[PDB]
Design a protein around this ligand. Structure first.
Ligand SMILES: [Cl-]
Ligand SMILES: [Cl-]
Length: 162
């Protein structure tokens, strides 16, 4: 297991524009296209992203291409965020995948806002962190995935993904 296999499981793979859990136009492996209620706006973002008129549909290779850019974007984000960097740097490789995951899902600023959980994570107070992480809209809106990510932070193993 690694970050890609992990997000591939949580995000799924769909080659036609669809709406995500929040109701936002998405494609491939959780590649958010836009927060706009307009499908044409989404379609424009799509063609811009791919570099061709996709008419709302892309290939598997294309989905994976956007996926790698996105994963990478999430990490670079963490690395450049004054609040996220120290945590990320303090964690072992398994646990940081849980952090990338959150960022991929809710954005840098979003996660950077989990002040209390971040500190507990940095402090390596695993069970306590896991409890604090769950007192969140995130956990309540996507409980099963949040449980996987949280279990990952708590144990530092890939159990929740097997
Ligand atoms: Cl809550
Ligand atoms: Cl879920």
């Amino acid at each position: 297991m690694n970050i890609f296999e992990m997000l591939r499981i949580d995000e799924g793979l769909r080659l036609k524009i669809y709406k995500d859990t929040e109701g936002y136009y998405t494609i491939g492996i959780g590649h958010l296209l836009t927060k706009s209620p307009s499908l044409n706006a989404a379609k424009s973002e799509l063609d811009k992203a791919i570099g061709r008129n996709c008419n709302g549909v892309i290939t598997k290779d294309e989905a994976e291409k956007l996926f790698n850019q996105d994963v990478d974007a999430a990490v670079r984000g963490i690395l450049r965020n004054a609040k996220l960097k120290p945590v990320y740097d303090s964690l072992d490789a398994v646990r940081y995948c849980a952090l990338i995951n959150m960022v991929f899902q809710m954005g840098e600023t979003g996660v950077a806002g989990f002040t209390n959980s971040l500190r507990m994570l940095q402090q390596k107070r695993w069970d306590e962190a896991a409890v604090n992480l769950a007192k969140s809209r995130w956990y309540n809106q996507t409980p099963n995935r949040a449980k996987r990510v949280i279990t990952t932070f708590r144990t530092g193993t890939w159990d929740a993904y097997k």
